[PDB]
């Protein structure tokens, strides 16, 4: 075995402490190039991390989580190797976790994945992630809404199906909510998702409109975060195209 | 008015000649930069194109769906202004015209949609041109075939949900069929359809693989043309991942 498969033998271990720190060594490994990436992903690591998300420890659910978030920032096979080991449902159940480091890395793995190919994206909102993602935009904690919310941004920039998931499971309403929102990171976010919703079907703009997002966003043409105003600019524009007709 | 809406309003001659004309002079300023494009979208010129497709005289049809296809090669604000218009559900419609220029015309049209965003492709699905494209496939006219080719592969880049229409018309086999052509642009385009194809759900590679893909594949890694051999590495590679898994 070479040096990452015996870190993911690790992973199996029996003490807590040689598993999270197996996971947390392959996360290090995995927040490097893409082909450190990609010897995880072939000596199996992804399976073994997916399993490793139903431990009774939270611990190492978080460490987990923390690795398989770091290996979905990696090429679209990193991506797929996470989706067809099941690894999307499990995160999406590890969201309402009530361990707030375990939401936060559940949800940010989940928004790397979604910056991925559009079956990486489809595989989230057949797992139901997009009405979780939503109710999490109102947690307590601004970490996990930044992660929600930049989940659901890059949720919205996949195909019709998933925006109209965001539009269905009412999240338009609450991403305008956030718009206004203090912190920074959040507010991007959600100005980024909502521009990206914009570019979708007509029923989407609708949803921006009844939520009395076209007047929150003229507002943010005047914030003093060029990236906030970026982002209202383009959710303007595309709300002034009206969407695509869904014929 | 300026001198492209003074084309524009000429297309509304009661005259062939004159409309046939104004077209063709559309065409060809479209053909031009993007600037040039937006320029005939800000003029209406998108909806009156589309109203000539219905024309009763085929060198009028022909011509107005050019002057489309080569607006549709421009930005997506173009192609988003020929589908807002209802222009998809009419070339679909002119695909199986008698007048094979009208024919061509009208799949180069869908297939520079198709190479547009995801809700783009939607709209060609939605419409139907699925299914008109893959019995376009096996037209008499090898112009046509390339065309319907080239915009299946394009229409095969999008969402899940367009490459199952491919496969549920039973485009694969047909395309699978084409690999062996001895037109290579043909050859070309059906490759890069299958490669798309392979990177889309684990349904589409059974398809394939039912359709006796894998070997044809195969036996072009031979090829002598580097692009046929590069599309055909590429569809072994995604075959090999298995596709996405459908949950």
Redesign the interface.
Known sequence: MNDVEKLVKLLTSTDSETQKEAARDLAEIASGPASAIKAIVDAGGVEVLVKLLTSTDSEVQKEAARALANIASGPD?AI?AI??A?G??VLVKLLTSTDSEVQKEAARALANIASG????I??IV??GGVEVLVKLLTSTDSEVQKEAARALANIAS????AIKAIVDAGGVEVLVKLLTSTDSEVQKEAARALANIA???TSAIKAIVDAGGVEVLQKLLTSTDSEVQKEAQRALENIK??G????
Request: net charge negative; no cysteine; proline share 11%.
């Open positions: 096979e797929k989706v067809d099941g999307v449902e190919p559009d079956e990486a489809k595989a057949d797992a996949g195909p019709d199906e570019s979708g079907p195209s009206g695509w007709l869904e014929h």
